[PDB]
Structure formats: structure tokens, C-alpha cells
């Protein structure tokens, strides 16, 4: 009968071979194992085979993915499997959903949300200097904030509008930063950057006033006590700052 271990499983999933997964469910069941058990995770990083599949796509797809999710379900393990956190040198708490967004894979973003992905999982920055040296790309930790900061308006739409589990526009990360605070973080002052950050900022403000008319999104304050306007001024984000200021004169006029 058919044995699985970690290098067997990771070789199958990195090749993206659904057929090699035959007998895996039965094996897990008869041996009373799960895909989240340490022997099926990469000891160095915490990665299960799902991040592995999602990092080894062939024409945007890895057909082990649907089969892994179903196996996890049938082993009473689906939420845990989907949300198993991993780490590298830049972030801890990263999940499959973060990867699917970063890789720009809307189809896998949907699949994973549909099957119970944590839409608010935080990819928290790691640091090695006495004071945080900023070696990680800061995008506001959260799945929605990543989609905004990587200019993926369709994923931003899906995440906030889908019929299964919606990411909250008002959500704040470990720094108390909302999506608008994170868009100020990634703002450099180059013109194409000012272009999209500004468009995405304005898109999300409207979206929020539509869904949550009782809330001003740019009023919500991080743990420095700063709005996105004031954070923009403290950190020299001229472009986003002037845009916001210019919008307020318009909306007061």
C-alpha cells in the first residue's frame, strides 16, 4: 500500500501532479495524520504543501490545489490547512492567501476564501536590528492591504464584495494602520506611484462610505495617533498629502 512523507508530497506538489496524490487521503486516514502535522510541514518555515503548490504554478495553475483542499476537508482539517502560517526572514504569519494575492492569482484567492481562508491574516514584519530597519516590504500586513498596495483592484473588489467572507475596509493591522495608512506607507513620490496610490485611496474611501456610511475611513487613527493625512505629512509623502488636502478643499467648496 502507498506511503507518503514530506519529500514525496513536496515533490508531487512542486511538479504539480494531481495523479501522484492518489492514495494520500486513504493514507492520512488509516495512519491518523493530517496535512498540518509537522512531518508534512517544512521545519524551516512552517509551510505546508499549499504554499508550495501556489509557489509552483504552470500556466498560472497547480492542479494539486483542489485535491489538497478536499483531502484536508475530509480529514477534518480544512481551515487549519488553509490558514497554516509560515515565516521567512521578512515576515511571520503569512498564509496561502497572501501568496495567491502576491502572485496575482484571483482564481486561487477566490477558492481559498470560499473554503475558509482568514481574510484578516497578518503577515507581520520581522526585524534584526535593535530598532526595526525596514528590510521587509511593508504593505499593511492584511490581505486587502496587500491587494491595494500591489494595485489589484479586482482582488480588492472580490475581497470586500464576495458572498462568502468579506475583508473589512476598516481593519487595522498590528501598527493600527488601515488600508489608507498602508497606501501612504508605500507611497514614494514618483509620479506613477502617486498616480495609483491616489486612485486606490479615493476608490477605497468611497467604497467605505458606501458600505459603512457611519464611518470616515481617513479619520481612523494608527498607534502613533495619526490619520493617513498626518502620517503622510510626518513621513514626507508630498504627493498623497497634497492630493488629500486638495480633495478636502474641493469637498468643502
From Swiss-Prot:
Residue positions binding ATP: 47, 52, 56, 91-94, 103
Annotated function: Non-selective calcium permeant cation channel involved in osmotic sensitivity and mechanosensitivity. Activation by exposure to hypotonicity within the physiological range exhibits an outward rectification. Also activated by phorbol esters. Channel activity seems to be regulated by a calmodulin-dependent mechanism.
Family: Belongs to the transient receptor (TC 1.A.4) family. TrpV subfamily. TRPV4 sub-subfamily.
Outcome reported for the amino acid change (mutating residue 74 to A): No significant effect on affinity for ATP and Ca(2+)-calmodulin
ANK repeats: 92-121, 139-168, 224-251
The protein's assembly and partners: Homotetramer. Interacts with Ca(2+)-calmodulin.
Domain commentary: The ANK repeat region mediates interaction with Ca(2+)-calmodulin and ATP binding. The ANK repeat region mediates interaction with phosphatidylinositol-4,5-bisphosphate and related phosphatidylinositides.
Region of the whole protein represented: 133 to 382 of 852
Protein name as catalogued: Transient receptor potential cation channel subfamily V member 4
Location in or out of the cell: Apical cell membrane; Cell junction, Adherens junction
Positions of a 1,2-diacyl-sn-glycero-3-phospho-(1D-myo-inositol-4,5-bisphosphate) binding: 104-106, 151-154, 199
Amino acid at each position: 500500500m502507498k506511503v507518503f512523507n514530506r519529500p514525496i508530497l513536496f515533490d508531487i506538489v512542486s511538479r504539480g501532479s494531481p495523479d501522484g496524490l492518489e492514495g494520500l487521503l486513504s493514507f492520512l486516514l488509516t495512519h491518523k495524520k493530517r496535512l498540518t502535522d509537522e512531518e508534512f510541514r517544512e521545519p524551516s518555515t512552517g509551510k505546508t504543501c499549499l504554499p508550495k503548490a501556489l509557489l509552483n504554478l504552470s500556466a498560472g495553475r497547480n492542479d494539486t490545489i483542489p485535491i489538497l483542499l478536499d483531502i484536508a476537508e475530509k480529514t477534518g482539517n480544512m481551515r487549519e490547512f488553509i490558514n497554516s502560517p509560515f515565516r521567512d526572514v521578512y515576515y511571520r504569519g503569512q498564509t496561502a492567501l497572501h501568496i495567491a494575492i502576491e502572485r496575482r492569482c484571483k482564481h486561487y484567492v477566490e477558492l481559498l476564501v470560499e473554503k475558509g481562508a482568514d481574510v484578516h491574516a497578518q503577515a507581520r514584519g520581522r526585524f534584526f536590528q535593535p530598532k526595526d530597519e525596514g528590510g521587509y516590504f511593508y504593505f499593511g500586513e492584511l490581505p486587502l492591504s496587500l491587494a491595494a498596495c500591489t494595485n489589484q483592484p479586482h482582488i480588492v473588489h472580490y475581497l470586500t464584495e464576495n458572498g462568502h467572507k468579506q475583508a473589512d475596509l476598516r481593519r487595522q493591522d498590528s501598527r493600527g494602520n488601515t488600508v489608507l495608512h498602508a497606501l501612504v506607507a508605500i507611497a514614494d513620490n514618483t509620479r506613477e506611484n502617486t498616480k495609483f496610490v491616489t486612485k486606490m485611496y479615493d476608490l477605497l474611501l468611497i467604497k467605505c462610505a458606501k458600505l459603512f456610511p457611519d464611518t470616515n475611513l481617513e479619520a481612523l487613527l494608527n498607534n502613533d495617533g495619526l490619520s493617513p493625512l498626518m502620517m503622510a505629512a510626518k513621513t514626507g509623502k508630498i504627493g498623497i498629502f497634497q492630493h488629500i488636502i486638495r480633495r478636502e478643499i474641493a469637498d468643502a467648496a
